[PDB]
Amino acid sequence: GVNSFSGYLKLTDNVYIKNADIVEEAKKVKPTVVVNAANVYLKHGGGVAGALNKATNNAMQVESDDYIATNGPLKVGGSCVLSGHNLAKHCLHVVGPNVNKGEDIQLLKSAYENFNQHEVLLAPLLSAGIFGADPIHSLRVCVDTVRTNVYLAVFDKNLYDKLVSSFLEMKS
Hints:
It is classed as viral protein. The protein is built from six helices and seven strands. It is α/β, with parallel strands linked by helices.
């Protein structure tokens, strides 16, 4: 059935983490909500966005282009709910700050706040990829902001191992 999450480490009651490829995990879990690491015009190139879109055979991009034509661009820190196509029931497209490009890291909390409208989500860490936020900081903001249940997928083994070990050094 849907939301078949298993094999995660519970960091807090709210936040779970796994070393996984989010696309493969979405196919296995059938989440009601997968989070995309989006940008304001929903141009899904590269990173998680490109990978999710490719796995939908570009259906996500076609739908996103229609969303933009009928709603305009998002703002940094904002989100929209669109179809999850074959990957999920819905995709929550969330725009975290691109700090390598001179967007304010302080907007990361507002980006995570979008998760609080959904009871269960499969998600990447926000503002990682080529966006430039320190992943441990992104995880901290996630833990301190999200109040539903988020299942985080971290691709690289070394980063996963570090996030766990570094997170466990912080005050509980």
